[PDB]
Structures are given as C-alpha cells and as structure tokens.
Design a protein around this ligand. Structure first.
Ligand SMILES: OC[C@H]1O[C@H](O[C@H]2O[C@H](CO)[C@@H](O)[C@H](O)[C@H]2O)[C@H](O)[C@@H](O)[C@@H]1O
Lengths: 133, 133
C-alpha cells in the first residue's frame, strides 16, 4: 500500500503535482483524492492490463463510502517501468488532470468539494515527489 | 494541524526532503517522524519564539507515548518569512538532519524502526514540496 496523506488543504486552482515511478511489471495504479478515504472526488486508475481493461484510465468518485459511476478516458500516456508526473487542480465544477505528453482531461466534481485534504496511492506507482504549487 | 503522511517506507540511507514557507511572524514549527503519533524517532521543533525559547532547535524522541531526553542544537539557520528546506536520513546509530545554510546535526536513533513510515507537520510552516530520493 502506497503513500497516504491528509490535511493537504489544497484549494481551488492550486496545483497538486505527483511524480513517481511506474513499475516495470505495471498492471495498474491508483491515485485517490478527496476529503478522506470514504469521500473521493477523484479515484484515478490507469489500467495497463487489469480487470479486463488494456491501456485505459478509469475514473470514479466515492460519496459516503458509495462508489459512483466509472468514467473511462480516451488517452493513456503511460508506459511501464518509467517515470510519470500527474498534475491535478479543481474548481467546484471539475477536476482537471494533466498527464505526460501534454494530455489532459476533466472529470466532474461530483462531491462539490471546496478543498482536497486527502490523497492516497496504490498499485504499481512509487511516489518520489509531491508538490503543492 | 499540518500535513500528515503515512506509509512513507523511508529505508536507512534514503533521503526525505521537505521544503516549506516559514510564516513572516512564525513562532515555531514541528516535523514529527517515526512510526505513528506515539512512536517518533525524531520530533524536530525549531523555536523562533516559543516556550520561553528564542531561535533554538529542540529535538526529542517519543517511544510508546513516552517523551525521551530532549536535546537542543547550537545553530538556527531559519528566518521568518523565508523558504526553508530540511533533509533527513538515518542509519541504526543516528538520524542526520541537514538544515539550510549547510548546517547539519545528528540525533540518536533511539527506536528500532526498520523504516520511517510516518511524518506529521505542525505550526508556522507551509509545506511546498516533499521528496523521497
Ligand atoms: O508544557 C509543554 C512543554 O512542551 C515542551 O516540553 C514537552 O515537549 C517537548 C518537545 O517539544 C519534549 O521534549 C518535552 O519532554 C515535553 O515535556 C517544552 O519544552 C516545555 O517547555 C513545555 O512546558
């Protein structure tokens, strides 16, 4: 189980930058962001080869412990056994997720969060650096 | 409270770097490192003006809830209203804390932790960057 962090106090428009090492055998990794582990405005799950997906990013929310509806993205600029950085911002309508190679996507802010206080990583992604601006 | 991180898995010899903004009217700040809130291999408390102390670094350990024997350092390379980075490693003998302006000191490793898995920050210090390498 990966890094867990709380009291992040990330505000709208502020950039959370996460750089890590994608494992060479990577099947999947997760970045979870929200208020706490039961209230996620972003479950960010790149799947290299996992649960029937190949090279697909699956996103979801979690509200009071209840998962929302999964959203599958159109791009996948990740490779196993490489360094990757992700950059996340939000406003009360959307999260914006910036990816390697100039790709980005928006995911609705379904919880209407005004602060992100919680982050957790899991799976085949070793975090090397977290920055808050 | 400030940032809390767990599952850091910082192994002997590896470097934890923490860069933050010291408040312009800062009185003190704290970085706590260890296993959990009751088991700290390093409580690192720069006091600008707190507890009757001026420009003093106060260090201690905490083992099973018990504060150890407090140690104070001789140098204080911190300024209110500035950016400061501290870099921490450990081996079985000591933690080595590297401060701004090239000062460093050692603090005895009083716990038998295989790794540092927990960090907590508090006080007049806004973390901007945490790196594990
Ligand atoms: O009254 C609270 C005291 O806080 C400090 O002392 C406690 O916390 C220290 C770490 O910052 C420990 O080293 C110490 O053993 C604890 O008793 C402060 O140094 C004291 O002056 C305060 O009275």
């Amino acid at each position: 189980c990966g890094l867990v962090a709380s009291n992040l106090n990330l505000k709208p428009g502020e950039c959370l930058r996460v750089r890590g090492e994608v494992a060479p055998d990577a099947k999947s990794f997760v970045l979870n962001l929200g208020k706490d582990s039961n209230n996620l405005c972003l479950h960010f799950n790149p799947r290299f080869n996992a649960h029937g997906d190949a090279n697909t990013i699956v996103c979801n929310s979690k509200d009071g412990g209840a998962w929302g509806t999964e959203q599958r993205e159109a791009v996948f600029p990740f490779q196993p056994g490489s360094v990757a950085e992700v950059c996340i911002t939000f406003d009360q309508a959307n999260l914006t997720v910036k990816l390697p190679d100039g790709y980005e996507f928006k995911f609705p802010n379904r919880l209407n969060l005004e602060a992100i206080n919680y982050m957790a990583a899991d799976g085949d992604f070793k975090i090397k650096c977290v920055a808050f601006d």
